[PDB]
Amino acid sequence: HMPLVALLDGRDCTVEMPILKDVATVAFCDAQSTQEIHEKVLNEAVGALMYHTITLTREDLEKFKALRIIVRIGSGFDNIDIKSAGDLGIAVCNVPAASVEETADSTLCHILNLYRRATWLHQALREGTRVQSVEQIREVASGAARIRGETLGIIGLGRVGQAVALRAKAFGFNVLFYDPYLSDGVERALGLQRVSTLQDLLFHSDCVTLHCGLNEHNHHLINDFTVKQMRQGAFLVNTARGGLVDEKALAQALKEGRIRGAALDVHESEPFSFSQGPLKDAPNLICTPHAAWYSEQASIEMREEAAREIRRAITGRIPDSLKNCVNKDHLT
Amino acid sequence: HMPLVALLDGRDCTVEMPILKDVATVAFCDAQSTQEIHEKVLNEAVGALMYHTITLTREDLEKFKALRIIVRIGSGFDNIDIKSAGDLGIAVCNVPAASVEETADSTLCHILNLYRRATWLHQALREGTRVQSVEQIREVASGAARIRGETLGIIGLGRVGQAVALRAKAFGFNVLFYDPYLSDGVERALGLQRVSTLQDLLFHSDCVTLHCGLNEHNHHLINDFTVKQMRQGAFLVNTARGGLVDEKALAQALKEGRIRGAALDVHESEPFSFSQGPLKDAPNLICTPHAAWYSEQASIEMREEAAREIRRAITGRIPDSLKNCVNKDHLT
Ligand SMILES: Nc1ncnc2c1ncn2[C@@H]1O[C@H](COP(=O)(O)O)[C@@H](O)[C@H]1O
Ligand SMILES: Nc1ncnc2c1ncn2[C@@H]1O[C@H](COP(=O)(O)O)[C@@H](O)[C@H]1O
Ligand SMILES: [Ca+2]
Ligand SMILES: [Ca+2]
Ligand SMILES: [Cl-]
Ligand SMILES: [Cl-]
Ligand SMILES: [Cl-]
Numbered sequence: 168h169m170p171l172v173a174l175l176d177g178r179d180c181t182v183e184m185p186i187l188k189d190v191a192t193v194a195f196c197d198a199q200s201t202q203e204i205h206e207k208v209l210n211e212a213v214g215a216l217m218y219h220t221i222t223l224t225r226e227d228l229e230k231f232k233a234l235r236i237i238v239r240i241g242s243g244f245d246n247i248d249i250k251s252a253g254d255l256g257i258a259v260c261n262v263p264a265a266s267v268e269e270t271a272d273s274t275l276c277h278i279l280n281l282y283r284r285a286t287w288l289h290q291a292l293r294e295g296t297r298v299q300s301v302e303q304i305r306e307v308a309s310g311a312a313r314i315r316g317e318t319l320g321i322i323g324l325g326r327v328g329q330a331v332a333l334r335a336k337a338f339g340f341n342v343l344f345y346d347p348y349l350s351d352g353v354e355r356a357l358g359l360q361r362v363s364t365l366q367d368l369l370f371h372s373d374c375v376t377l378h379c380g381l382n383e384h385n386h387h388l389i390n391d392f393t394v395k396q397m398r399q400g401a402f403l404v405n406t407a408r409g410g411l412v413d414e415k416a417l418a419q420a421l422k423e424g425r426i427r428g429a430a431l432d433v434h435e436s437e438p439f440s441f442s443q444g445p446l447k448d449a450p451n452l453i454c455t456p457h458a459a460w461y462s463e464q465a466s467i468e469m470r471e472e473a474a475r476e477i478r479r480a481i482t483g484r485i486p487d488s489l490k491n492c493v494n495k496d497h498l499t
Numbered sequence: 500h501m502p503l504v505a506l507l508d509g510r511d512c513t514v515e516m517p518i519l520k521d522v523a524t525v526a527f528c529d530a531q532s533t534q535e536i537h538e539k540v541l542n543e544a545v546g547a548l549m550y551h552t553i554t555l556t557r558e559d560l561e562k563f564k565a566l567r568i569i570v571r572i573g574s575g576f577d578n579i580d581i582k583s584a585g586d587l588g589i590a591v592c593n594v595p596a597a598s599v600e601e602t603a604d605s606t607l608c609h610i611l612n613l614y615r616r617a618t619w620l621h622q623a624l625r626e627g628t629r630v631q632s633v634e635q636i637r638e639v640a641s642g643a644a645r646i647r648g649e650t651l652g653i654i655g656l657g658r659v660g661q662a663v664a665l666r667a668k669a670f671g672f673n674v675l676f677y678d679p680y681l682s683d684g685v686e687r688a689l690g691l692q693r694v695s696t697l698q699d700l701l702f703h704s705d706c707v708t709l710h711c712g713l714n715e716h717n718h719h720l721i722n723d724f725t726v727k728q729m730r731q732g733a734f735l736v737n738t739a740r741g742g743l744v745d746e747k748a749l750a751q752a753l754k755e756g757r758i759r760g761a762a763l764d765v766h767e768s769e770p771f772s773f774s775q776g777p778l779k780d781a782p783n784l785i786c787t788p789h790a791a792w793y794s795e796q797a798s799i800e801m802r803e804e805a806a807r808e809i810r811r812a813i814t815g816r817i818p819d820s821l822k823n824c825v826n827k828d829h830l831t
C-alpha cells in the first residue's frame with residue numbers, strides 16, 4: 168500500500184492530489200479536534216496536512232501511532248506543540264512566503280480604514296445616515312486624521328512586518344519597530360527607527376500593528392499593563408494572532424476611549440462573533456474573519472508547496488529533504 | 500461700514516473670523532441654493548465663501564449686485580461657472596493643497612478595500628456570518644486578489660493623482676496614467692508609464708481610479724461606451740467628482756459582473772442614498788459620503804487659507820494679490 172496522508176481540518180484536497188497521487192493515499196477528516204478524527208488515520212497516518220482551526224497538544228500528538236511529518240498549510244504554527252512533536256519524532260513544517268504581501272496589504276487597508284474611517288463611513292451610509300452639509304461630513308467622519316507625521320509602531324519586523332514598513336513609509340508614516348530577536352543593524356539597512364523595549368514602542372507610536380508569531384513568551388503581549396503604556400487615543404491593528412492581545416483589556420480601553428479604534432483579523436476565540444466574547448459591546452471596532460492571508464494565488468501557492476513538502480518527506484530523508492521544517496531543534 | 504462676506508452653504512465660521520475680524524462683516528446663510536440666500540447678501544455681499552453643496556450658474560451669479568470675489572473652501576470648483584463669473588467681474592479661487600494626501604490615502608484605502616474586501620468582510624461579520632473553516636474563509640472572502648503585478652490606471656496625474664501613483668507603487672502595482680494636458684516627459688520624472696488615449700488606459704488597467712477635475716469636456720467620462728472598453732472584472736474608484744461617471748451605465752456593469760467592484764466617495768447626486776439613484780440595487784459597491792478630503796488638520800488648513808484669500812482680495816488688488824485664483828483668464 169501507499170503511505171496515508173490526511174487533511175485534518177479540511178475537506179478540499181483537489182489542489183494537492185496531482186502532486187501526491189503516486190506517492191500517498193490522501194484523505195480528509197474535516198475535524199475541529201482529534202476527537203473527530205477516525206482512528207484509522209490516528210493509527211496509519213504517515214503524513215498530515217492542517218490549517219489553523221485544529222490545535223494539536225502533546226496529548227493529541229501521542230494519539231498518532233505512525234505520523235512522521237506535519238505540514239501546516241500556512242505561515243503560523245502556534246497551534247502545534249512542535250516541541251513535543253519533535254520529541255515524538257514528528258517533524259513540523261510551514262509555508263511562510265505564500266501570503267506575506269497579502270497580509271501586509273490587508274494590514275495597510277486596516278490601518279487606512281482606521282485613519283480614514285472608510286469602513287465606518289460605509290456602514291453609516293447603509294444604515295441611512297444623510298450627509299448633506301459640510302458640517303455633517305465633519306461629524307460622521309469625526310476622528311479621521313492626517314497620516315503624514317504619524318508614528319506607526321511595528322511589533323515584529325519579520326517578512327510581513329518589513330512589507331508593512333515599506334508600504335507605511337509611502338504614506339508619510341514615521342515607522343518604528345521593536346524586535347528583540349533581530350541582529351544589530353537591521354534598522355540601518357531598511358532606513359527605519361528601532362526601539363529596545365516594548366514600552367518604548369507603545370510610548371511613541373500613534374498606531375500599533377502586531378506582526379509577531381505567537382510563542383511561549385509573548386502571550387497576551389497587549390495586556391491591561393502594556394495597554395496603559397500606549398498613547399492616548401492610539402490605534403491597534405492585529406493580523407498576526409489573536410492570542411497576542413487580551414481582548415478584555417482591549418474591550419475596556421475602547422469603551423473608555425484610551426484606544427480610539429482597533430482593527431482585528433485574528434481573535435482569542437475563532438470563529439469571531441460580535442455577540443460573543445469580551446468584545447461584545449466594544450466600540451470603534453473593525454473585524455475581518457481571519458482573511459488577511461487569503462488570495463486565490465496565495466491559496467493555490469501554499470497548498471501546492473505544502474503538498475510538495477509532504478512529498479519530499481515521504482520520498483526523501485527527514486528532516487534533511489524538508490525545505491521549511493521549524494522543529495529540527497527538537498526532532499529526535 | 501465693512502465689506503460683507505458670506506458663507507453661502509454653511510453655518511460655522513469660527514475658524515475664519517480671527518482672520519477676517521477687522522476686515523469684513525461675516526455672515527452665513529446655510530443655503531442649498533440661491534433661493535435660500537436672503538437678498539441682503541445678494542445686494543451687499545462683496546466676498547463669498549462656499550463649499551461644494553451649492554452650485555452657482557450664470558443666473559445665480561447675476562443675482563449678486565456687489566460680489567467681487569468667490570473663494571471655494573476646497574480644491575474642486577466645478578460647481579461654479581467661473582467663465583461667466585469672470586464675465587461679471589467676479590474672481591474665483593480655491594484651496595488646492597489642503598487635502599491632497601488625505602484624498603490619496605482615502606483612495607488607497609478604497610483600492611485596498613476592493614482587493615482585500617476588508618469592508619465587505621466586516622459587514623458580513625456584523626450580519627452574523629460564521630466563518631469557521633478554511634473553505635468558508637475562501638468563500639466569504641471570495642474575490643480577494645493579489646495586488647503585485649496588477650495594473651492600476653490613473654486618469655488625471657495631478658497633485659492627488661501623483662500621490663496616488665507613488666503610494667500605489669509601494670504595493671507592487673504597475674501604475675499607468677492618462678493625462679492629455681501634461682507636458683511631454685512627466686512620466687520619466689516619476690518613473691511611471693503613460694498612455695495616449697483613455698481607451699488605452701481602460702484596456703490595460705485592472706483597476707481604474709479617477710483623479711481629474713470635472714470640466715466641460717469630461718462629463719460622463721465613464722459612460723456606457725467607455726465602460727465597455729474596460730477589462731473584464733475591473734475595479735472602479737472615484738474620489739474626484741460624481742459627474743465623471745454615468746451611474747446608470749455603472750449600475751448595469753456591476754449587475755452583469757463586467758465590473759467586479761466599485762468604490763465611490765462622490766456621486767452624480769449628493770447626498771448619496773442606497774435607496775435612491777441609479778445605484779439602488781447595484782452589487783459589490785462601497786460608498787463614502789464625500790469624505791475623502793476631510794481631516795481635522797485639512798479642514799482647519801483650508802478654512803484659514805480661504806479666509807486669508809478673502810482678506811487679500813479685500814485689502815489688495817484683484818486679481819494680482821490673490822494666490823489661487825482660477826479664472827484670471829475670464830476675469831474682466
Ligand atoms: N514578542 C515579540 N516581540 C516582538 N517581535 C517578535 C516577538 N516574537 C517574535 N518576534 C519577531 O517577529 C518576527 C516574525 O517574522 P515572520 O516569522 O517572518 O513573520 C521575527 O523577526 C521575530 O523575531
Ligand atoms: N478628461 C481628463 N482626462 C484625464 N486627465 C484630466 C482630464 N481633465 C483634467 N485632467 C488632469 O487632471 C489633473 C488634475 O490635477 P489637480 O487639479 O491637481 O487635481 C490635471 O493634471 C489635468 O490635466
Ligand atoms: Ca491621535
Ligand atoms: Ca482581475
Ligand atoms: Cl487630523
Ligand atoms: Cl485554493
Ligand atoms: Cl489572486
Ligand SMILES: [Cl-]
Nearest residue numbers: 514798799802
Ligand atoms: Cl474645521
